[PDB]
Design a protein around this ligand. Structure first.
Ligand SMILES: Cc1cccc(C)c1OCC(=O)N[C@@H](Cc1ccccc1)[C@@H](O)C[C@H](Cc1ccccc1)NC(=O)[C@H](C(C)C)N1CCCNC1=O
Length: 330
């Protein structure tokens, strides 16, 4: 089997991407944030505290003839930015772009934190990291990809995120028309439950490539590119007037600037992020100071190849017995 679904930026800055997902019988379509950095499929629901729902589409399990409460099961998650959600668990039928999983754990929110309430465009998350990170207690549950993997033509999914444009998540096959050149594969450590890999280095604009190992995670659920402070300082030094602002919480730059590209290494291959991908617009409405898309990972504890990096590539998440990650230019 295979599946294919279009993923769409939620706003003009590509702050996140949403993908339609069919849940239950008859289908209830919710737009979920596909997140290779977490392993819970959770949704706004008829059980979510009413004051915490503000425009989201909700899952109503009582209207699904295939929904079953998973007795005694609860979930609770806290994300890297301090956002959180929690609730109970149903099993139900879940389909993505024609690919169907029966018995998928659908985590129904009773509580969500304010950042989720304030984003009317995201109806929940679909986790695509490894199932060891799933938060359901007392019995951990499997991700959508884990449940589907054995049925897929190939045990893979691919992320093709667009810049200011729609893109595609494919399950079970590699669309050889979606990229240029070859796919370079690189080793993955699953010990932290992430798609964790080691970049071979970087370059800023037309500058010299610096060979240096950068351990980090491929995370479709993080907007920006978070890299070591030395790397990020070298990038923003090439942007006249850029500075790290402690009040804003990262590097800002004059909105009139033309940003240089940023290149990262995948083995001997190179992925080039165009400068425009690194512009996240005014820090506040009407300001001429703009927020940078490459930021220091010092406060995080891990480097994150988020959407800024991944949308410059066609990315293969290979879930074979020994998982690997593939990157191609496109
Ligand atoms: C679940 C789990 C188990 C074990 C260990 C950890 C760290 C676990 O947490 C996983 C985790 O936080 N993953 C995040 C990136 C992560 C992995 C490991 C450590 C730290 C972080 C990321 O993919 C998911 C989450 C999605 C989200 C959150 C709030 C609103 C909307 C979307 N995204 C975010 O937190 C990011 C942060 C990092 C800037 N974020 C917040 C919104 C706006 N945009 C955005 O980019």
């Amino acid at each position: 089997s295979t599946g294919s679904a279009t993923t769409t930026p939620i706003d003009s800055l590509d702050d996140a991407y949403i993908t339609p997902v069919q849940i239950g019988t008859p289908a209830q379509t919710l737009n979920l944030d596909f997140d290779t950095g977490s392993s819970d499929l959770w949704v706004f629901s008829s059980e979510t505290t009413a004051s915490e729902v503000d425009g989201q589409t909700i899952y109503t399990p009582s209207k699904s003839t295939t929904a079953k409460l998973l007795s005694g099961a609860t979930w609770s998650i806290s994300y890297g930015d301090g956002s959180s959600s929690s609730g109970d668990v149903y099993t139900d039928t879940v389909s993505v772009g024609g690919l169907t999983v029966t018995g998928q754990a659908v985590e129904s929110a009773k509580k969500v934190s304010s950042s989720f309430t304030e984003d009317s465009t995201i109806d929940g998350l679909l986790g695509l990291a490894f199932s060891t990170l799933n938060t359901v207690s007392p019995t951990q549950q499997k991700t959508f990809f884990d449940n589907a993997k054995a049925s897929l033509d190939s045990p893979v999914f691919t992320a093709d995120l667009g810049y200011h444009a729609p893109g595609t998540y494919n399950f079970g096959f590699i669309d050889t028309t979606a990229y240029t050149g070859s796919i370079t594969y690189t080793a993955v450590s699953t010990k932290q439950g992430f798609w964790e890999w080691t970049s071979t280095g970087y370059a800023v604009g037309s500058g010299t490539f610096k060979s240096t190992s950068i351990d980090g995670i491929a995370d479709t659920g993080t907007t920006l590119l978070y890299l070591p402070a030395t790397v990020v300082s070298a990038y923003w030094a090439q942007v006249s007037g850029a500075k790290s602002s402690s009040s804003v919480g990262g590097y800002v730059f004059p909105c009139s600037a033309t940003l240089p590209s940023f290149t990262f290494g995948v083995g001997s291959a190179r992925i080039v992020i165009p400068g425009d991908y690194i512009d996240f617009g005014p820090i506040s409405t009407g300001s001429s100071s703009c927020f940078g898309g490459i930021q220091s990972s010092a406060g995080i504890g891990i480097n994150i190849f988020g959407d800024v990096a991944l949308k410059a590539a066609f990315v293969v998440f290979n879930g074979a017995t020994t998982p690997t990650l593939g990157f191609a230019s496109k």
